[PDB]
Amino acid sequence: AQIFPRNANLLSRLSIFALVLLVVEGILILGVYFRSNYFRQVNVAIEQPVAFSH
């Protein structure tokens, strides 16, 4: 009550919670990128110079 509003007690705890979620989301995004079909070029029909149809 000296230098802080009343809502800060809730915000501070919520901020710590939000921080943990953001950290977990960061690792998640990292792993999804290194296993995606764009990074590994999976299910991507690479265009050939002569357009050969198997």
């Binding site: 809730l10 919520l14 979620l21 989301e25 998640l28 995004i29 999804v32 296993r35 995606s36 079909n37």
Partner: peptide
């Protein structure tokens, strides 16, 4: 408060499911 924490969880769940879908897009 549990309401805000559950709300932030549902947001994190939605964001992650979108990221997981974008990986196998």
């Amino acid at each position: 408060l549990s309401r805000l924490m559950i709300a932030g969880l549902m947001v994190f769940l939605v964001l992650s499911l979108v990221v997981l879908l974008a990986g196998r897009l």
